[PDB]
Design a protein around this nucleic acid. Structure first.
Ligand SMILES: [Mg+2]
Lengths: 446, 82, 51, 492, 252, 95
DNA sequence: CCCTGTCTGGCGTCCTCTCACCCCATG
DNA sequence: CATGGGTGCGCCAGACAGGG
């Protein structure tokens, strides 16, 4: 423009033609930048931050190899002190002199002076090895890297998102009980029992008799038995009880069965490990159940009898909303549930108007490419199966392919006039050019 | 609005319902005509089907009103000329 | 910290006769159930009368 | 780049006939405003464009003021003079600032300010050159028709408006139609239409006649007055100083061709053309055309004229809905009463009888002598009280003693009537006597006098109960006023 | 930027504008159905449960696509042909496709049943309203056989609904479920135990008699009362529920 | 609601300190504060009595530091050249 | 020519979400 | 620098030989 060409006069530079524009990045994810790598093809000028990373890694590798030498030298001097306990020991004269000369003290030709000579060989090897390895590590940090044809420098940045949980993630147990988590309730609405504790997750019972995975209910009852033993340990430890009662109860919880393989006894743990073993058992007692030689029903019942839980595994549960009891007492316990990485803020996607493909003027495919969902062939059949005719016409002429049709559509939508000017799919013209590029003469009559 | 059952009870084809209601909604939205039933800030589609349910609009009345309000425009033009 | 969304009866759509429908908004993400349950249990029995 | 600034200044100066200086001042203000928008803080900014190179320097301006209200844009005179001793109140202190790159953003701002400067220079000078058009019949194209106004395009980015009251009642314009109208007002408003055009006002008629009648454009014939009922009927009064020219015949033209051209432009409005006379009665006779006037009686004191017509002409003299009499009254400036010859005689007989009754009642004269006074032209007690003694002495049978006695009686009658009305309401008698009690406003004194409480004694004789119905008088205020009246009348 | 004023704009455009939900393996025409959106704090499409039996959609990780009818004829085709209230019968036959699937038939089968003794055995009740009042206050049980007085409307004339009121020997749960049945159906549609075939022919007889709009609103009230009393039922599954036959070892 | 609420009623003159403040509390630039201390201006009440023309005579006080002082005084509702009768109060004359 | 064996062609569910890698070779 | 050449599918079906 007159003023854009006048730039040279009023301000300076030259003329405003090349589009000044800084490569800015897109959205959808938060994070915290934890690690930045900068690789430089050799010959290119390192900028100030690449020299900052070079000084940083030089400093880290310098400190690390110096600590290798210091720590292994500390172990070597501890070996020298361990050898010189006998055979010409100096109890006071050992720490009067500097520590690097612990060899010329009074001691004859024995295995000990031979061992001090071997440790001197090791020490001088560590000295010259530290010299040559620090030189090689400065070479590895300082050098460039072979890279792609025609690239100056590569910057890699590591974002660290923390994804919590939300309605839409997929959780599942270990038996095939899948499920999209559907509502994240408050604490108060949960069914609680006549102790006070709310249950965390409410599954659905109807998945059990059809999908025949009856193992999850035995896993639930045995998990409640394990947590009953853990609650009794927490009760016997929170009251600051001496180690005798803890030894009694842990021994009763570890015998408990038929002819089994475990057969432990706590009489060889010596009153300090038992407190730390109970510090590790207070959040529950882990139970092994091998695959086809597992815990039968009567053993689960006898372990639910050791805790003061009900025998059938079912506690009566109150309601959170009404505050009145559920009839016919329900099954609670602990199930070990897994979060799967089919999350919901990796599948969710939406597109009004994005980019368009090049050879056939249709939208791109995928999520990383900001794309639209494939209105496939069977959906075209399902709209022929109704009487929906205008919905299919805009579903494959206006919304998808015809470029003048969709710019007329976008103007008509932002002006309030819901109306389509149909036109022709441009990919049908591509079909005409591909059939016509053979010896075939396809046309459009009239 | 939930069901469109009586709008098919008064126009038996269920495909002519879509044409009559689309013609009516295009007259109400861009052409700037008043709705013949008092709305509740409904969109023009539901107001079209709501006029169909009252019975005061179908294809016969729409052709009657387009012929009369085209003859009115040409009559105004002819009385302005002569 | 003691400031909640104080609610109100936005309308009393009394449907026909001897029948009302009283809607109350807005309450907290959990107070609709406690006021519905409190008023439901009290009206059911506590409320006196003659028969 | 450099030479391009000069080429742009020369092109714009030549095309818009605008001072180069005014374009640069505006570009400097535009660039200063564009610079201010790039900073997050409200700064003051001066831009200076070099008139030879087109190079420009941008400052942080500091308006030198006596008292600083805005430290971000203002500096004290003492602080400004520390940097440059030559600075005065109202000057700017600068600060080396990076000039905004001339991107298409600044370019668009510069274009907008140039366009605005051209509206206040090129278009302003065009309106000044068209001083005739600002007053004469401008021609526009209808751009937009709204319910309450019509927007006209005059060309050169000039828009005019015709208001609904400024249109003829039967006109229907469409976008693209050509419309003529008088530019009756130019308003320098910061928003809205600046040019107001009328087709309904009388000026539209005058200027159409100026264009259609060469003798009016040459100042040989003058239009003295115009009265108009827009789109229905108008009257124009014409005069000439040249005795060889018939002014009515000139405005009508050959077979009415000129008046019919004006009528056709006004949607078939009927135009009567009348001869202006310097005698008001003769001018009103001409204005009443096409009705024949039998007699006129002029009341100069009321600025009214009674017009007698034959009973057959009464309906024509009044016209449809009084249109003829109203247009004649607006054209003459007189209030015109149209009646029959018989009704005028009956009115004069009733007025003469009322004057005789008034004189007999107030002057203590016989009916014969009162009749002589009315026959000599006396109708009011004021005329008899104030007229020169010579005119009363010209009446046969009046001597100087009788004229003096008649004047004294007329003055005493006028004084008695004044006192009667002043006691009936609160003009003077109750506005002094009844209003003596402290607190009595003139309105309350007239409310009291309407109950027959005319004096301060009459108020002293009242009870609170006798005054309780007077709007705005509380029992406490009534009691206070009665006690104040009693204190003056009975204890003064 | 997503300022504070565009969410009111969004609740203006979503209103009365249907969308086409679509399961990814669409086999028949009931796999594209048009809904009206209700906005969700979240990132997951909430889909009404009865409609799931049309899509063959469980909730084990399924995904669906939404499509927007842009033009005005397409909004009217989504409301008048492809709306989910309009697809209540499968086009392959005459069977209803909005049949209540799994939780709701358990809630009904636990509700309308009986046991030979409960709270309020054989007491007499003046209506279904105080049947629900006796269930809620804690004076009777959900399945306790009881004479009630119900008023069933049989439409035996030509389009006129005739009221007949009588005392049915029934349960408490059958009266509570009678509070939801529309007018024209007889009481014997709820007098039985209501498995899945019986609730399917309940909705089918409602569609054949009372038409479309009572069948849509009654399908919703069926689903709501099934979910609510299945929640009140507490119908778990245990290890003791699978009763081993005592005669099994001798047979082997 | 009345029943449930009745079942819960057993549960439920150197102007002012601004003037009396030291000039250092005005968050002035280290230059402006040191220029004011060199002229024995210790309190905000001393600063407010000085005219703009007097402050410009102070050694090393520039036009920029004067604008800073005005902007800071204006942020506290104070202006240069206010006359305080009875300043400094006898409570300050002994430091 | 009327039946029989062989030889080649045509075809086999729909949506999605990542990843990895796209012609040597050389006088 | 620019160019230059495996050996796990199974049924249907009709056209091409191949006897018959
Ligand atoms: Mg699935």
């Amino acid at each position: 423009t007159p003023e854009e060409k006048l730039l040279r006069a009023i301000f300076g530079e030259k003329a405003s033609d090349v589009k000044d524009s800084s490569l800015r990045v897109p959205n959808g994810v938060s994070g915290t930048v934890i690690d930045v790598q900068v690789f430089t093809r050799d010959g290119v000028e390192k900028d100030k931050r690449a020299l900052e990373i070079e000084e940083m890694q030089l400093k880290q590798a310098k400190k690390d190899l110096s600590e290798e030498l210091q720590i292994l030298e500390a172990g070597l001097f501890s070996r020298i002190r361990a050898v010189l306990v006998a055979g010409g020991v100096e109890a006071e004269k050992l720490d009067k002199l500097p520590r690097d000369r612990w060899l010329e003290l009074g001691l004859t030709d024995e295995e000990k002076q031979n061992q001090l000579e071997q440790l001197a060989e090791q020490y001088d090897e560590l000295k010259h090895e530290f010299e040559k390895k620090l030189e090689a590590k400065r070479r590895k940090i300082t050098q460039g890297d072979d890279l792609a044809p025609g690239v100056l420098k590569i910057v890699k940045v590591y974002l660290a998102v923390k994804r919590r949980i939300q309605p839409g993630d997929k959780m599942a147990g270990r038996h095939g009980n899948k499920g999209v988590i559907s509502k994240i309730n408050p604490i108060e609405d949960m069914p609680y029992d006549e102790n006070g504790t709310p249950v965390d997750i409410v599954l659905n019972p109807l998945g059990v008799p059809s999908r025949m995975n009856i193992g999850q209910i035995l896993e639930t009852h045995l998990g409640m038995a394990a947590k009953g033993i853990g609650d009794k340990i927490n009760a016997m430890l929170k009251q600051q009880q001496e180690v005798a009662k803890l030894r009694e109860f842990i021994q009763r919880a570890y015998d408990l069965g038929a002819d089994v393989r475990q057969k432990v006894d706590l009489s060889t743990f010596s009153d300090e490990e038992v407190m730390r073993l109970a510090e590790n058992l207070r959040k529950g007692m882990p139970i092994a159940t091998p695959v086809f030689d597992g815990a039968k029903e009567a053993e689960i019942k006898e372990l639910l009898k050791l805790g003061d839980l009900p025998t059938s595994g079912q506690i009566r549960l109150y309601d959170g909303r009404t505050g009145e009891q559920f009839e016919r007492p329900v099954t609670v316990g602990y199930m070990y549930m897994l979060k799967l990485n089919h999350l919901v803020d990796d599948k969710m996607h939406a597109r009004s108007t994005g980019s368009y493909s090049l050879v056939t003027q249709q939208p791109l495919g995928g999520k990383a490419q900001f794309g639209g969902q494939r209105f496939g062939e069977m959906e075209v059949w399902a709209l022929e199966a109704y009487g929906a005719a205008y919905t299919l016409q805009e579903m494959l002429t206006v919304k998808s392919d015809d470029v003048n049709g969709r710019t007329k559509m976008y103007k008509n939508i932002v002006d309030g006039n819901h109306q389509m000017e149909p036109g022709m799919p441009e990919s049908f013209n591509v079909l005409l050019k591909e059939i016509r590029s053979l010896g075939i003469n396809i046309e459009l009559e009239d | 609005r939930v069901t469109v059952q009586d709008a098919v009870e008064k126009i038996g084809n269920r495909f002519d319902l879509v044409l009559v209601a689309a013609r009516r909604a295009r007259q109400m939205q861009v052409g700037g005509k008043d709705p013949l039933v008092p709305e509740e800030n409904d969109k023009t589609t539901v107001i079209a089907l709501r006029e169909i349910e009252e019975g005061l609009i179908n294809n016969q009345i729409l052709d009657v009103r387009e012929r009369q309000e085209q003859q009115e425009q040409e009559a105004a033009e002819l009385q302005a000329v002569t | 910290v003691t400031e909640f969304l104080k609610p109100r009866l936005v309308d009393i759509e009394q449907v026909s006769s001897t029948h009302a429908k009283v809607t109350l908004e807005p309450l907290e993400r959990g107070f609709g159930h406690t006021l519905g349950n409190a008023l439901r249990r009290i009206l059911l029995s506590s409320m006196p009368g003659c028969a | 780049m450099n030479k391009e600034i000069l080429a742009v200044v020369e092109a714009v100066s030549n095309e818009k006939a605008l001072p180069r200086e005014k374009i640069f001042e505006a570009l400097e203000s535009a660039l200063a405003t564009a610079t201010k928008k790039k900073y997050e803080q409200e700064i003051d900014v001066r831009v200076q464009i070099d008139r030879k190179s087109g190079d420009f320097d941008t400052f942080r301006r500091w308006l030198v003021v006596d008292e600083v209200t805005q430290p971000t844009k203002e500096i004290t005179l003492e602080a400004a003079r520390y940097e440059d001793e030559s600075l005065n109140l109202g000057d700017y202190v600068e600060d080396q600032i990076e000039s905004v790159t001339f991107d298409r953003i600044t370019t668009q701002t510069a274009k907008q300010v140039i366009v605005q400067k051209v509206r206040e220079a090129e278009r302003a000078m065009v309106v000044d050159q068209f001083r005739e058009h600002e007053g004469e019949i401008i021609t526009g194209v209808v751009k937009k028709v709204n319910r309450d106004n019509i927007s006209l395009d005059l060309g050169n980015n000039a828009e005019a408006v015709i208001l609904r009251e400024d249109m003829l009642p039967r006109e229907n314009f469409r976008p693209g139609d050509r419309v003529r109208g008088v530019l009756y007002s130019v308003r320098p408003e910061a928003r809205g239409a600046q040019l107001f055009v009328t087709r309904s006002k009388p000026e539209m008629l005058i200027e159409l006649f100026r264009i259609e009648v060469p003798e009016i454009g040459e100042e040989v014939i003058e239009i003295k007055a115009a009265a108009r009922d827009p789109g229905s009927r108008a009257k124009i009064a014409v005069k000439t100083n040249d005795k060889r020219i018939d002014p009515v015949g000139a405005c009508v033209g050959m077979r009415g061709a000129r008046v019919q051209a004006v009528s056709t432009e006004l949607g078939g409005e009927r135009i009567d053309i009348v001869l202006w006379d310097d005698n008001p009665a003769q001018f009103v006779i001409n204005a009443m055309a096409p009705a024949d006037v039998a007699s006129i009686v002029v009341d100069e004191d009321k600025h009214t004229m009674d017009i007698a017509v034959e009973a057959g002409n009464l309906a024509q003299a009044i016209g449809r809905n009084g249109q003829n009499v109203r247009l004649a009254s607006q054209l003459s400036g007189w209030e015109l009463n149209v009646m029959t010859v018989d009704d005028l005689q009956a009115k004069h007989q009733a007025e003469a009888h009322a004057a005789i009754d008034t004189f007999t009642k107030y002057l203590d004269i016989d009916e014969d002598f009162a009749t002589v006074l009315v026959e000599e032209g006396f109708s009011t007690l004021e005329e008899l009280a104030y007229v020169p003694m010579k005119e009363l002495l010209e009446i046969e049978g009046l001597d100087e003693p009788t004229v003096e006695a008649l004047r004294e009686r007329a003055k005493n009658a006028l004084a008695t009537i004044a006192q009667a009305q002043e006691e009936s309401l609160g003009d003077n008698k109750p506005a002094d006597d009844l209003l003596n009690l402290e607190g009595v406003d003139r309105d309350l004194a007239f409310k009291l006098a309407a109950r027959g409480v005319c004096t301060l004694e009459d108020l002293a004789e009242q009870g609170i109960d006798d005054l309780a119905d007077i709007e705005g008088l509380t029992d406490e205020k009534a009691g206070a006023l009665i006690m104040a009246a009693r204190n003056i009348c009975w204890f003064g | 930027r997503e300022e504070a004023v565009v969410w009111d704009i969004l609740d203006e455009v979503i209103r009365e504008h249907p969308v086409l939900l679509n399961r990814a393996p669409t086999l028949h025409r009931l796999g594209i159905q048009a809904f009206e959106p209700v906005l969700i704090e979240g990132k997951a499409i909430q889909l009404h449960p009865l409609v799931c039996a049309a899509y063959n959609a469980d909730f084990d990780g399924d995904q669906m696509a939404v499509h927007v009818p842009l033009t005005l004829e397409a909004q009217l085709e989504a409301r008048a042909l492809m709306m989910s209230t309009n697809n209540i019968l499968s086009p392959a036959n005459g069977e209803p496709i909005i049949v209540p699937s799994q939780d709701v038939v358990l809630g009904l089968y636990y509700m309308t049943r009986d046991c030979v003794n409960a709270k309020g055995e054989g007491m007499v009740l003046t209506g279904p309203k105080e049947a629900e009042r006796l269930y809620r206050s804690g004076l009777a049980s959900l399945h306790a056989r009881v004479k009630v007085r119900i008023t069933e409307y049989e439409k035996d004339a030509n389009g006129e609904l005739v009221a007949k009121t009588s005392l049915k020997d029934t349960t408490v749960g059958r009266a509570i479920l009678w509070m939801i049945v529309p007018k024209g159906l007889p009481y014997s549609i709820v007098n039985q135990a209501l498995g899945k075939k019986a609730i399917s022919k309940m909705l089918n007889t409602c569609y054949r008699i009372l038409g479309l709009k009572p069948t849509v609103i009654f399908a919703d009230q069926i689903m709501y009362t099934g979910f609510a009393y299945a929640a009140r039922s507490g119908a778990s599954v245990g290890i003791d529920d699978m009763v081993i036959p005592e005669k099994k070892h001798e047979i082997i | 609601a009345t029943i449930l609420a009745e079942q819960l009623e057993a549960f439920v003159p150197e102007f002012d300190p601004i003037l009396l403040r030291p000039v250092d509390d005005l968050e002035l630039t280290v230059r402006s504060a040191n220029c004011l201390k060199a002229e024995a201006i210790h309190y905000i009440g001393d600063l407010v009595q000085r005219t703009e023309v007097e402050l410009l005579k102070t050694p090393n006080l520039g036009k920029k530091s004067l604008t800073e002082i005005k902007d800071v005084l204006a942020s506290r509702g104070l202006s240069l050249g206010m006359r305080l009768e009875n300043w400094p109060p006898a409570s300050i004359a002994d430091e």
